Design an enzyme around this catalytic site. Sequence first.
Site, PDB file in Angstrom:
ATOM      1  N   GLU A   1      -6.116   5.004  -9.457  1.00  0.00           N
ATOM      2  CA  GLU A   1      -5.134   4.632 -10.683  1.00  0.00           C
ATOM      3  C   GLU A   1      -4.948   3.127 -10.667  1.00  0.00           C
ATOM      4  OE1 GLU A   1      -3.200   7.212 -12.685  1.00  0.00           O
ATOM      5  OE2 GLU A   1      -5.326   8.755 -12.927  1.00  0.00           O
TER       6      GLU A   1
ATOM      7  N   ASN B   1       3.363 -34.968  -5.874  1.00  0.00           N
ATOM      8  CA  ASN B   1       2.802 -35.092  -6.526  1.00  0.00           C
ATOM      9  C   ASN B   1       1.252 -34.499  -4.932  1.00  0.00           C
ATOM     10  OD1 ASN B   1       2.454 -35.956  -8.606  1.00  0.00           O
ATOM     11  ND2 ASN B   1       1.575 -38.084  -8.163  1.00  0.00           N
TER      12      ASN B   1
ATOM     13  N   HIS C   1     -27.544   7.591 -12.818  1.00  0.00           N
ATOM     14  CA  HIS C   1     -27.501   7.274 -13.725  1.00  0.00           C
ATOM     15  C   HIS C   1     -26.765   8.390 -14.408  1.00  0.00           C
ATOM     16  CE1 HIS C   1     -31.301   4.748 -13.995  1.00  0.00           C
ATOM     17  NE2 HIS C   1     -31.973   5.500 -13.099  1.00  0.00           N
TER      18      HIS C   1
ATOM     19  N   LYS D   1      -5.154  21.648  -9.123  1.00  0.00           N
ATOM     20  CA  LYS D   1      -5.511  20.319  -9.988  1.00  0.00           C
ATOM     21  C   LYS D   1      -4.257  19.035  -9.205  1.00  0.00           C
ATOM     22  CE  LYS D   1      -3.876  19.037 -14.799  1.00  0.00           C
ATOM     23  NZ  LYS D   1      -4.340  19.467 -16.297  1.00  0.00           N
TER      24      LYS D   1
ATOM     25  N   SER E   1       2.118  21.384 -10.343  1.00  0.00           N
ATOM     26  CA  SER E   1       2.690  22.742 -11.110  1.00  0.00           C
ATOM     27  C   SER E   1       1.704  23.674 -10.559  1.00  0.00           C
ATOM     28  CB  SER E   1       2.464  23.301 -12.671  1.00  0.00           C
ATOM     29  OG  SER E   1       3.181  24.173 -13.211  1.00  0.00           O
TER      30      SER E   1
ATOM     31  N   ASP F   1      15.419 -39.136   0.007  1.00  0.00           N
ATOM     32  CA  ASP F   1      15.423 -40.469   0.832  1.00  0.00           C
ATOM     33  C   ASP F   1      15.558 -39.153   2.291  1.00  0.00           C
ATOM     34  OD1 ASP F   1      16.033 -41.912  -0.686  1.00  0.00           O
ATOM     35  OD2 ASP F   1      17.708 -43.039  -0.804  1.00  0.00           O
TER      36      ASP F   1
END
Length: 462
Positions: free
Chosen positions: A330, A140, A187, A323, A317, A131
């Site tokens: 990712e 809705n 390409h 590396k 490492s 109320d």
Amino acid sequence: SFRIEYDTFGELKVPNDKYYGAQTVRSTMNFKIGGVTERMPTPVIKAFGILKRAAAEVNQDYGLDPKIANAIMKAADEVAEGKLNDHFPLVVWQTGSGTQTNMNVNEVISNRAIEMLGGELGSKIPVHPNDHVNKSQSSNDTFPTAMHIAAAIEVHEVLLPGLQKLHDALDAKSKEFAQIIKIGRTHTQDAVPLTLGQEFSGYVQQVKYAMTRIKAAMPRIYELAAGGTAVGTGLNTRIGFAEKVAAKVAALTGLPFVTAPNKFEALAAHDALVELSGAMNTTACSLMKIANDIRFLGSGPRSGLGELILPENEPGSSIMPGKVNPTQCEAMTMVAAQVMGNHVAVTVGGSNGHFELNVFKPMMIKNVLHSARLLGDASVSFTENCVVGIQANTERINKLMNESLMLVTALNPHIGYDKAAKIAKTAHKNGSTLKETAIELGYLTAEQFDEWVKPKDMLGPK
């Protein structure tokens, strides 16, 4: 450690430390799908607090007791600020109108307001969930309003600032790499030169255009359903409520919310969410391409492309120097894939409205907010933990420019096509450079090669 409340189906134990009530406990009993990670997104909850705060103040125009309104406003402010997140246990996979979450918002705000007023929790006195807290509103037209407030704030606070940061860092790198010439790839074959700056300027443009696309999807998100009530007509709300609540939400948020011109369109469909998801879907395609390129451009150290040296943010490492896994690429490309799947989920829901009400609303806003947060956060992370620290491997790039067969066309106006071709062929066969070969073939001198083959002159039209 629980209080007893009632619904027309019976009595329910409500924990004493929870601000929700019987309607919410019942909802938990009937919609046990997917667990806690499936709880209604917090930005939807906060948006509900904004709407209920807005409605309470406006409803003072329509007979709501000022003392009750003000406690509602204060309690709804707490919800909107994220101080009561623990009192919303319901999942996305409830009713398609999001009615349970509306009821639980109403209960939490009722009980906290009751508490502020020194009343008894669970008593609906003096603040009644329906109320007072749901006054002039419908099951809705509230959830849709919450969806759009949520989406707009997320785009404004998270998604767009994240992309802007990425844009700026990509642009900065573009300028830093403006003079570094490398071998183009089409390409994935070797192709005529372009600068790293030119290549990065493509990324910049994509992010720029991504922000324009997302912005262009926002005007329809600013339209609010509040006031449509049950089926769109505004039956059982008051004249002026639609327009006042929108203006009030606009004042509280500083975003340009208005009431939807057609409430039937606003209730029976969420095409705006589909289009916003659509713009994010394009954004995901841009970011997939930008992050994947960078991934590959940083491949190596010696069996890859090796153009870029990416920041190393976590221990590798010592016996593996050079590396570096492109970890942020990712994370970003995974987000990009998620967004594209989220877009299909959004699409299937948006396509399946029935008559006066689309009842796929919770799943639609979930997927839109998920995509917007992932994109915004990933952009920030990708920027700070990768893009800004990117260095060009100019030593390897200079070497590969000199070993390229691509530059041989620069010889044509000096020695002709056939001598130029024979140089390229022989270099290709012997695994030597264009210069070495051209010299060995006696076609030219070293001094001539340097004067005639200038990469800087191979970067534009004539």
